[PDB]
Write a protein that binds this DNA or RNA. Structure first.
Ligand SMILES: [Mg+2]
Ligand SMILES: [Mg+2]
Ligand SMILES: [Mg+2]
Ligand SMILES: [Mg+2]
Ligand SMILES: [Mg+2]
Ligand SMILES: [Mg+2]
Ligand SMILES: [Mg+2]
Ligand SMILES: [Mg+2]
Ligand SMILES: [Mg+2]
Ligand SMILES: [Mg+2]
Ligand SMILES: [Mg+2]
Ligand SMILES: [Mg+2]
Ligand SMILES: [Mg+2]
Ligand SMILES: [Mg+2]
Ligand SMILES: [Mg+2]
Ligand SMILES: [Mg+2]
Ligand SMILES: [Mg+2]
Ligand SMILES: [Mg+2]
Ligand SMILES: [Mg+2]
Ligand SMILES: [Mg+2]
Ligand SMILES: [Mg+2]
Ligand SMILES: [Mg+2]
Ligand SMILES: [Mg+2]
Ligand SMILES: [Mg+2]
Ligand SMILES: [Mg+2]
Ligand SMILES: [Mg+2]
Ligand SMILES: [Mg+2]
Ligand SMILES: [Mg+2]
Lengths: 106, 271, 88, 56, 55
RNA sequence: UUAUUAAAAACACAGCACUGUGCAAACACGAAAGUGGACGUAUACGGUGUGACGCCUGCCCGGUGCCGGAAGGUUAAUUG
RNA sequence: CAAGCUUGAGUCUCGUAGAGGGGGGUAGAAUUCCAGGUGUAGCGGUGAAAUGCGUAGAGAUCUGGAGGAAUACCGGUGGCGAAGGCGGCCCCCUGGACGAAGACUGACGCUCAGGUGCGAAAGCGUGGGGAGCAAACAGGAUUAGAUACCCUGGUAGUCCACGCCGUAAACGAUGUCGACUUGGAGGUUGUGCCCUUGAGGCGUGGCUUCCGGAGCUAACGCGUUAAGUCGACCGCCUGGGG
């Protein structure tokens, strides 16, 4: 029942499924009695180096309080999904809700 | 678990057996049994066509599903059983409608596990899906060559197949021999490896253990007369010739594949 | 190692009050809960030699405390090793 | 150390820019160190000696 | 305290070739130089910063 | 194991190795249809050599074989 | 022997830093190989060469793919660990250390023959893997010779899992534990207070580096992290060879 910061970037050719992709993963998280601290759609962003002959991935950030058996199944759906090109789960000490620098860079 | 025997007799000194305690100690499922009588390596002309085959223990045949086409319906594994017809173990599964089938037992699968076939199944060891729905890089077994025909590759104990690439209507597989092969993407595969991976760790220990499996003794061609083998003859131990088969074809190195209609599917031969 | 509420249950259960954390029976029972818990770790991680050295310090500290308790008060010592299942 | 030549910049000032840029970027010394293998006991002995003779 | 997502702060601590500048020169204290290098390495993985120039 | 002058140090053997074989398998018996291999699928199957186990297994690719390569030289039917 | 005490030794509460250990994923740069494109006579190597590679199209250059190993910069007289040792990033399991204010137990302590465990690299066994490097080996040089130093290749090994071995200039060539004995300059990691702007300063713990005083030492040197002044216990030495 720990805090996690999750970043995943999406292939840009399926960027209109992104609000559908977010609200599908939320029902698995709030449905595990885990609370959601932040949820930021960053949009299309120029990559610093090419991945899979690409640039301009679609970045989504969220900060989550959840148990470990929900976050373990979130990377199985990160792995077997062909739309997520890159993801990153990190453990956090305390829940974060202040706006990130990516929201205040707009 | 490999176990060493104690040298209480000279025929027991070198015996190493593989003992699996999770196998079913009991009789097999009788509706899935058939008669299977032995050949002696003789064909319908009555002639020996393969040497060194004969005797051994009586065996009944288990009908194993290599097709895995009961799509959509879940199945729970009842127990693991011994199969005398192959090196791998088999599992008895129970579908929700009440059908029982034998499958090849993959690695790590116990009683109470849930398997499912079909196009919309989950990516976990034991499930069978078409290879256009399997991630590239996966380890699969019981792989089809034609769609609907049934699994033919990676059946022996501990064997598997890696899906190396998917380009178009074909996928490229790295076979267990080291061969790269194209197979069409509508063929099914089962996730995981085949179980019983320490089958190659066993030591028979004595000549009778080979005779229990229906293996007859091999005579060296150099131990014969010239009328019997190309290697025969000599006054003492003479060889003097290039090593050949009993029918005169140079063995020890010469390639024998001559099949022009399947050569387009083979990307790289083994090394 | 041991968590906070699993720790505080043993102090209320095995001590004189909720302030008595330092008595001999509490220290033996706090070591016994972690020693029995770390068996599941070392059944998976046989090659973890650097953690097993810290497990063996709890084993030698419980044995020294048990031999001290037996020399002072044997009647209290018999109650503890039955409740925890030590020495058979 | 990629350096573009700007407008009406002579040649010898962009040569000097390229020379100054890869001297600061540390490219020739990274290549000349990585040309032979050094044992980790020789790396520590050189590292210890360079730290002791940094005594002003 | 240092964050990998703060790209404008992290870019004042890399060279034009992308190498991390040592705190001998930048003057960062030792506790924050370790937090800077770990956070720069997280950002390189998300391709917010580059490892090199050529790529 | 040489029925009927040879029972052995010969044959087999568990173990070891090399080699072929991607399944309409290699291979074998069959003018062929088919069959065995196998209701097996490379942890498998055929051929060859050595012969439990222990310590081991050095140098040579000039000759013959085999695997690979294709610039070039030479080269049949066919055309004329 | 009995009864105590809290100063030694332990337990709990709140935090901090860390390449401490085990397991599973993943990323980028580079080398090698395979396929294709462009292109044409050299490449490679050395003190100079040759062996080798290359007109059957090399080396160079671009695109795509496979695979293994190691993680530039950060990076340090830096940190952790009993020692051996440990360095990309992420997750799971897990050991220790240190600080603050308290509360608790009440000498529960120190050392340790025999015993048990851990223990670099090389090596051995069984099964895998095999890019780079490289004992043995081969060829080319150098040389009086050259079983070498140099060059071109190259197998075991180096890598993984599970067992074995039990040795190193395994070194601080300095056993462990405790108390006492002037100072200076630093590093690292906590914490307290003061005008909490200036923001900076003064203390108080842990670990660590370099000088140096008394004292000690054959000298060199060591010097509050002692090789100074003492106590407890253990290991070990008795001329050089053999
Ligand atoms: Mg045979
Ligand atoms: Mg044999
Ligand atoms: Mg004869
Ligand atoms: Mg003949
Ligand atoms: Mg003969
Ligand atoms: Mg003779
Ligand atoms: Mg002969
Ligand atoms: Mg911890
Ligand atoms: Mg006779
Ligand atoms: Mg007879
Ligand atoms: Mg007779
Ligand atoms: Mg007789
Ligand atoms: Mg006899
Ligand atoms: Mg044979
Ligand atoms: Mg023989
Ligand atoms: Mg030829
Ligand atoms: Mg670590
Ligand atoms: Mg080319
Ligand atoms: Mg090996
Ligand atoms: Mg050399
Ligand atoms: Mg080895
Ligand atoms: Mg010694
Ligand atoms: Mg050492
Ligand atoms: Mg040292
Ligand atoms: Mg010594
Ligand atoms: Mg000094
Ligand atoms: Mg002096
Ligand atoms: Mg003597």
């Amino acid at each position: 029942m720990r805090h996690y910061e999750i970043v995943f970037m999406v292939h840009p050719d399926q960027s209109e499924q992104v609000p559908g992709m977010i609200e599908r993963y939320t029902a698995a998280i709030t449905g595990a009695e885990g609370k959601i601290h932040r949820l930021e759609d960053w949009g299309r962003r120029q990559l610093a180096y090419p991945i899979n002959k690409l640039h301009k991935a679609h970045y989504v950030l969220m900060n989550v309080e959840a148990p470990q058996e929900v976050i373990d199944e979130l990377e199985t759906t990160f792995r077997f999904n062909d739309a997520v090109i890159r993801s990153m789960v990190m453990r956090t000490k305390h829940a974060v809700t202040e706006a990130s620098p990516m929201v205040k860079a707009k | 678990a490999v176990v060493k025997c104690k040298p209480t007799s000279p025929g027991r000194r070198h015996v190493v057996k593989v003992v699996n305690p999770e196998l079913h100690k009991g009789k097999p499922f009788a509706p899935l049994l058939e008669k299977n009588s032995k050949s002696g390596g003789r064909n319908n002309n009555g002639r020996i066509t393969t040497r060194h085959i004969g005797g051994g223990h009586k065996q009944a045949y288990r009908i194993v599903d290599f097709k895995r086409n009961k799509d959509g319906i879940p199945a729970v594994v009842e127990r693991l059983e011994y199969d005398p017809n192959r090196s791998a173990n088999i599992a008895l599964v129970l579908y929700k409608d009440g059908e029982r089938r034998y499958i090849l037992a993959p690695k790590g699968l116990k009683a109470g596990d849930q398997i499912q076939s079909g196009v919309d199944a989950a990516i976990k060891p034991g499930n069978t899906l078409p290879m256009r729905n399997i991630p590239v890089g996966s380890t699969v077994h019981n792989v089809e060559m034609k769609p609907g025909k049934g699994g033919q590759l990676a059946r022996s104990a501990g064997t598997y197949v890696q899906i190396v690439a998917r380009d178009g209507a074909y996928v490229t597989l790295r076979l267990r021999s080291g061969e790269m092969r194209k197979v069409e993407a509508d063929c099914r595969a089962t996730l995981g490896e085949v179980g019983n991976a320490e089958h190659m760790l066993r030591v028979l220990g004595k000549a009778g253990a080979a005779r229990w499996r229906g293996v007859r003794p091999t005579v060296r061609g150099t131990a014969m007369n010239p009328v019997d083998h190309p290697h025969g003859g000599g006054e003492g131990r003479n060889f003097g010739k290039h090593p050949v088969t009993p029918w005169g074809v140079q063995t020890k190195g010469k390639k024998t594949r001559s099949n022009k209609r399947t050569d387009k599917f083979i990307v790289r031969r083994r090394s | 190692s041991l968590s906070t509420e699993a720790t505080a249950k043993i102090v209320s259960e095995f001590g004189r009050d909720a302030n008595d954390t330092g008595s001999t029976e509490v220290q033996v029972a706090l070591l016994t809960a972690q020693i029995n818990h770390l068996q599941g770790h070392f059944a998976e991680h046989k090659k973890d030699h650097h953690s097993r050295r810290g497990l063996l310090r709890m084993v030698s500290q419980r044995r020294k405390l048990l031999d001290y308790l037996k020399r002072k008060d044997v009647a209290r010592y018999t109650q503890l090793i039955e409740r925890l299942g030590l020495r058979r | 150390p990629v350096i573009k030549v700007r407008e009406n910049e002579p040649f010898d000032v962009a040569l000097r820019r390229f020379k100054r840029s890869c001297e600061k970027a540390g490219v020739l010394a990274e290549v000349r160190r990585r040309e032979f293998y050094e044992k980790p006991t020789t790396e520590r002995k050189r590292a210890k000696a360079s730290a002791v003779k940094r005594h002003a | 305290e240092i964050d990998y997502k703060d790209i404008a702060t992290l870019k004042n601590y890399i060279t034009e070739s992308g190498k991390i500048v040592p705190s001998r020169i930048t003057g960062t204290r030792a506790k924050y130089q370790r937090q800077l290098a770990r956070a720069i390495k997280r950002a390189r993985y998300l391709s917010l910063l580059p490892y090199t120039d050529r790529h």
